Design a protein around this nucleic acid. Structure first.
Lengths: 180, 186, 66, 155, 86, 223, 125
RNA sequence: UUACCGAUACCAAGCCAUAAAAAGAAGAAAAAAUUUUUUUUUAGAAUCUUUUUAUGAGUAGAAAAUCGUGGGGU
RNA sequence: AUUUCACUCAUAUUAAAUAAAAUAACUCCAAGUGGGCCAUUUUUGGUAAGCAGAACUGGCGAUGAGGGAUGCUCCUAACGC
RNA sequence: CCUAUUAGCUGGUUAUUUUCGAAAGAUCUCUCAGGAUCGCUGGAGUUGAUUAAUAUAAUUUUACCAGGUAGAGAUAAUGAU
RNA sequence: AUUUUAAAAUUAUUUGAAUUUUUCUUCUUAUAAUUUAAGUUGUUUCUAUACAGUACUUUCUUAACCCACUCGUCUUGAAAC
């Protein structure tokens, strides 16, 4: 495992419930899937949505469950459509975006990077609704569509990224970006 | 940086050493500091503390008050860290065993004539090193005239402080602010 | 010329430097201007109590000291 | 420039909506004894015996009782220290305080509780319980009412 | 008493056993448990794994139910949005 | 003229034996509690039902900011918690009162649930104790059970393992053990903080607030 | 910089000099605490003339002794050297400046037969 | 996402002072020569001695302890 | 209401929690000060102001150190060697 | 010469280390460049504490009070519209 | 010069027991030693088989890296044009 490569987003399944009062003997319990850096942040987000959607605050609630969801096949690439709600500098907008990778958390990390890069949307301005795996026949974004051809191949035009050890300061002849 | 009170140093108040350079009193302070340390006796601790006090906290104790304070237990010995002064208003004395810092000549003569005895603190440490049958006494530490000027300022309502005046006739500090007929009273 | 008319700045921290001192709350309070015809009768009550106690004390002392 | 007795009391010393008129006759039957606590709530219908603006809503101890008035000791903060102030009011502007009513009920309840416990020679903890962390619970909910929640879109 | 060097109560064995009279027993038990031969574990790994097939099935069922509930929420919200489209 | 030393040695031997038995029972209790929670979660999830664990009853709090520019309420709460220096740490028992006290200090601390190994490490390698007369305490590293016996023995807390047990399981003698224990003086974290300015629960990197179980790795880096 | 010679630590050498004594002749180098108002040295600005403070004090086990691990004692005649008869290992002697050549010689010979070391033994000869 | 660099702040240790504390008004240790010598020490000042812990910005201002100068007794 | 006798109301964890809470309380004598200014948040006059006037807290002043290239007041953090 | 007149004003006001450490508010003032007085500070001293507890607390908890600011409203009143 | 003790640990014998069943298993029974206890000790060189040097200590003078505005003063604020 390469920590230079891993991101720190995980999916958590959190179940909570208002404390039973004398008014209602047993409140309905709520469950949610939240992507967060750790279970503590996931629970904070869960209570934020509990309070925002229902009229239920952490001080009047209790946590029935909180466990990390692990992807079944972390080495099988799949296409994800993620619905999204975020507020820009002048309004709120819901959009829909598509990624493809091996884990839902990885797709969400891609989503965060891309929303920051394209719209300057900080993570505090993003609400993730409805990330779900989609079928190839229902993929809608062209940048994902072109990734699903019968045989997919292309050259390797990236510049070489050597190790620090061989990233030597003085070269004896000009290297080639063509390499290949 | 640490957020402590007084930067973390415990502050004591009051005397820490004898100020008097009287060699006999220095010897007595040494003896009673040792006694207070080596025995557990709060008696000796109190005596060691009181030997150190200023003059105004070692006031005289008159013979009448001495023999009045020692009325109920007559076979004990009364220890005073001040001086014992005579009381002419007292008609008769009776058989007092008194340890004290100093006795006036009249008080000493009267005590020996009544048949009691006068003791110094070294003799007290010799015979009652723990303070058995020894009653600690002190004179009036607040009776002195200086305290009569202290407290609420003379001029504050219901104040009993004596003012500082050259003399105390009708024409000294007695007109305006001291009677209703001239503005107000006190 | 013109000056700062007023401020309460630093006054609270001056106040807390020597703490917010509490009243002492003594056990007894003077009854000087309070409920006459009640505290006078209390004076009479206490005098009666003291005399009844003291005459017993004098009797016991006299009969034990001959 | 203006600092009269009732300055600033436009709203505090006004009777509440549909609560005007003199006090009920039952207020005069309220028992007061020396040393018990009391609230100073000014009744603007009664103009005599009215407390000063500051003491409205303050609690104090009775130090004096007259035929129609009460003297109460109230703590007032004056810069670097508190001090007792002897405020003299009429009985309409004063009301028996419930500041220690839970204390009195606790005293009676614990009296009987520890009486019976000492009868049965059990060592009981009598202090208040300052409830904190709750224990684990093995609680079952019918899955027909577990609702999944998603953040909501914008409209 | 004169202040001496504060010994490491965790790595200095004599002072650790001084502080915790049970520590040497606990450590010997842990070491002895460590020293078990690899043959028993190698021969019993399948025995100790095959007991958990029912737990794996129940686990799969609960995660399947959770995923299904999420998907049904997806479908309900999509159906409501299609309702309000018209 | 020599019976005194023999009696002293025998009493010390009996104390050592009682401490050993108590510690063995404590280890058994820790293992039993862990196994019980494991199997009970197993059973809860096998059944179609939810199991919510108890709240942890004790938290470890680390100060994050220095001494300058603090509101009077925050300074008062800091003094009440005995967090006077920038990297001080204390154990705080959890109830409504302490949680409300911790709320007003939340932006300037980070706290969480310690776990047994970290409690043991804190006491064993950073555990100093208030030894002297009352109000004359004289911080001393433990190095021995003599002073623990002398001050806390009347509650039978002879021993650092007794101290560890009472701190970890918020037992009958927690206030006395916690007060007897001098406030921990922790090192700066080995890898640094993320940003003391922002909450641990903020989406951006941050440190202050309740870290829950994540306090253990920070304590380990700070120890 | 500290210097160590065996057990002897001198927490600082190059004794403190008065502020601006370098560039004013009327200001002698003997240390004076700058009372000042905007005084740089008093405010402890970086890179200028640090002030003495008690923290520089030397270990009191080795506070007053000379590079020979002995305390200096100054003598004016032969009679002031009697106490060293039983302090010869921890005290060294130094003859006072205003002592003539005969008293100097006598002091040197008496110290030698007391085997007490002399600091300024080769003066006025 | 990691690693790193970076304070007079933090941590461990030493030393100075300040505050507080625990306590105190008598006997041989070693080494080098050759049983016998030799070398060191062999303590006891109470505003003192030993040990311990924490602490240390500072104008105006206050205090203590120290350092010097003319002259006078001893 | 007071006084005297009874009986007894947790304390072996302390009539809720926490507390380098007695570093307390009190008295005496006395210094300097009594032009302030700045930041956040609130706020009045003014078109506005590095303007004038207020509230809370923290600062600068009285204070250096690391950072903000630079900077009385910002951030970190306050200072024996 | 009285006279070294008086100055709420300007300038100056001489060794070290150590410890504690402010105010630029307030009330009165022919007061507004001043003063007295309170506050803040030092020194001295006693009473206490030295008994992990009581006193105590710029803190919370539990119980009980008091409020008319933000908001809200304009069909509740008043005043607008 | 009457706690560098005692204990703890370890080694070698020793009595019994227990158990995770033993070449670091634990608990004491006794003895003897050790240190992991009870804050650094040893060996070998060099200085050197010198009497002050080209070494070592120290003062001074010069550089070099980093830093460093003119003090006193009134002032909210001075390196101040």
């Amino acid at each position: 495992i390469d920590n230079s490569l891993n991101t720190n987003i995980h999916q958590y399944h959190i179940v909570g419930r208002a404390i039973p009062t004398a008014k209602d003997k047993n409140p309905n319990v709520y469950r949610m899937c939240i992507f967060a850096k750790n279970d503590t942040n996931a629970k904070s987000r869960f209570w934020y949505f509990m309070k925002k959607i229902n009229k239920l605050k952490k001080s009047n609630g209790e946590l029935l469950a909180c466990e990390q969801i692990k992807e079944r096949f972390p080495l099988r690439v799949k296409n994800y459509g993620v619905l999204l709600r975020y507020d820009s500098r002048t309004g709120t907008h819901n959009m829909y975006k598509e990624f493809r990778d091996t884990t839902k958390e990885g797709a969400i990390a891609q989503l965060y990077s891309e929303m920051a890069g394209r719209h300057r949307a900080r993570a505090s301005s993003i609400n993730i609704i409805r990330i779900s795996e989609i079928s190839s026949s229902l993929v809608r974004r062209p940048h994902i569509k072109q990734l699903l051809k019968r045989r997919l191949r292309f050259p390797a035009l990236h510049l070489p990224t050597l190790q620090k050890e061989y990233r030597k300061k003085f070269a004896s002849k000009r290297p080639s970006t063509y390499r290949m | 940086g640490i957020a402590l009170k007084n930067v973390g140093r415990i502050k004591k108040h009051g005397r820490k050493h004898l100020v008097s350079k009287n060699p006999y009193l220095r010897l007595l302070v040494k003896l009673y500091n040792f006694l207070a340390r080596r025995t557990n006796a709060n008696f000796n601790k109190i005596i060691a503390k009181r030997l150190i006090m200023p003059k105004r906290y070692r006031p005289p104790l008159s013979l009448s008050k001495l023999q009045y304070h020692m009325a109920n237990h007559p076979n004990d010995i009364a220890v005073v860290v001040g001086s014992i002064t005579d009381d002419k208003r007292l008609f008769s004395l009776k058989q007092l065993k008194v340890c004290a810092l100093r006795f006036t000549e009249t008080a000493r003569k009267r005590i020996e004539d009544a048949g009691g005895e006068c003791l110094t603190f070294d003799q007290l440490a010799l015979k009652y090193p723990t303070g058995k049958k020894c009653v600690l006494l002190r004179g009036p530490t607040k009776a002195r005239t200086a305290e009569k000027h202290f407290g609420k300022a003379p001029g504050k309502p219901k104040s009993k402080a004596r003012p500082y005046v050259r003399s105390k006739g009708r024409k000294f500090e007695k007109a305006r602010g001291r009677r209703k007929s001239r503005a107000y009273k006190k | 010329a013109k000056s700062k008319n007023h401020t309460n700045h630093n006054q609270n921290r001056k106040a807390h430097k020597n703490g917010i001192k509490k009243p002492k709350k003594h056990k007894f309070m003077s009854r000087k201007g309070l409920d006459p015809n009640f505290f006078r009768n209390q004076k009479y009550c206490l005098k009666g109590i003291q005399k009844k106690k003291k005459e017993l004390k004098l009797k016991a002392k006299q009969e034990k000291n001959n | 420039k203006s600092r009269g007795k009732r300055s600033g009391t436009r709203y505090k010393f006004s009777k509440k909506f549909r609560k005007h008129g003199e006090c009920t006759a039952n207020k005069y039957l309220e028992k007061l004894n020396y040393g018990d606590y009391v609230d100073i709530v000014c009744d603007s219908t009664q103009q005599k015996g009215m407390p000063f603006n500051y003491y409205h809503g303050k609690t104090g101890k009775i130090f004096h009782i007259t035929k129609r008035g009460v003297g109460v000791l109230v703590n007032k903060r004056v810069k670097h220290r508190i001090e007792q102030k002897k405020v003299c009011v009429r009985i309409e502007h004063v009301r028996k305080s419930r500041c220690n009513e839970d204390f009195l009920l606790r005293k009676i309840k614990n009296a009987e509780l520890i009486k019976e416990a000492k009868l049965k020679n059990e060592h009981i903890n009598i202090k208040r319980k300052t409830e904190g962390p709750k224990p684990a619970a093995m609680i079952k909910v019918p899955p027909s009412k577990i609702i999944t929640i998603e953040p909501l879109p914008f409209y | 008493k004169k202040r001496l060097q504060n010994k490491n109560s965790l790595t200095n064995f004599a002072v650790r056993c001084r502080l915790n009279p049970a520590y040497k027993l606990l450590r010997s038990l842990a070491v002895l448990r460590m020293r078990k031969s690899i043959l028993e574990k190698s021969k019993n790994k399948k025995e100790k794994r095959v007991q958990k097939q029912i737990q794996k099935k129940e686990l799969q069922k609960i995660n399947h139910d959770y995923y299904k509930g999420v998907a049904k929420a997806v479908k309900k919200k999509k159906k409501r949005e299609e309702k309000k489209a018209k | 003229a020599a019976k005194k030393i023999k009696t002293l040695k025998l009493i010390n031997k009996k104390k050592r034996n009682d401490l050993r038995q108590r510690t063995l029972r404590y280890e058994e209790e820790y293992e039993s509690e862990r196994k019980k929670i494991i199997e009970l979660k197993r059973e809860a999830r096998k059944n179609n039902c939810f199991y919510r664990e108890a709240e942890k009853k004790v938290v470890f709090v680390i100060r994050l900011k220095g001494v300058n520019k603090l509101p009077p309420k925050v300074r008062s709460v800091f003094r009440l918690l005995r967090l006077l220096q920038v990297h001080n740490g204390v154990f705080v028992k959890v109830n409504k009162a302490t949680k409300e006290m911790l709320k007003i200090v939340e932006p300037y601390v980070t706290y969480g649930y310690p776990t047994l190994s970290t409690v043991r490490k804190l006491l064993y390698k950073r555990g100093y104790v208030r030894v002297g007369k009352v109000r004359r305490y004289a911080r001393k590293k433990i190095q021995d059970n003599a002073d623990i016996s002398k001050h806390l023995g009347k509650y039978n807390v002879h021993g650092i393992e007794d101290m560890v047990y009472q701190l970890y399981t918020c037992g009958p003698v927690f206030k006395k053990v916690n007060n007897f224990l001098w406030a921990f003086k922790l090192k700066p974290p080995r890898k640094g903080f993320k940003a003391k300015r922002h909450a641990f629960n903020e989406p951006r990197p941050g440190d202050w607030g309740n870290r829950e179980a994540h306090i253990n790795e920070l304590i380990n880096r700070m120890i | 910089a500290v210097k160590k010679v065996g057990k002897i630590i001198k927490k600082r050498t190059k004794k403190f000099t008065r502020f601006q004594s370098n560039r004013f002749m009327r200001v002698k180098p003997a240390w004076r605490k700058p009372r000042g108002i905007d005084c740089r040295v008093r405010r402890r600005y970086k890179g200028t003339n640090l002030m003495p403070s008690i923290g520089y004090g030397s270990n009191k086990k080795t506070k007053f002794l000379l590079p020979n691990n002995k305390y200096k004692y100054v003598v004016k005649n032969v009679k002031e050297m009697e106490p060293l008869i039983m302090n010869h290992t921890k005290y060294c002697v130094q003859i006072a400046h205003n002592v003539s050549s005969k008293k100097r010689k006598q002091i040197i010979e008496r110290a030698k037969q007391m085997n007490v070391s002399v600091i300024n033994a080769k003066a006025r000869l």
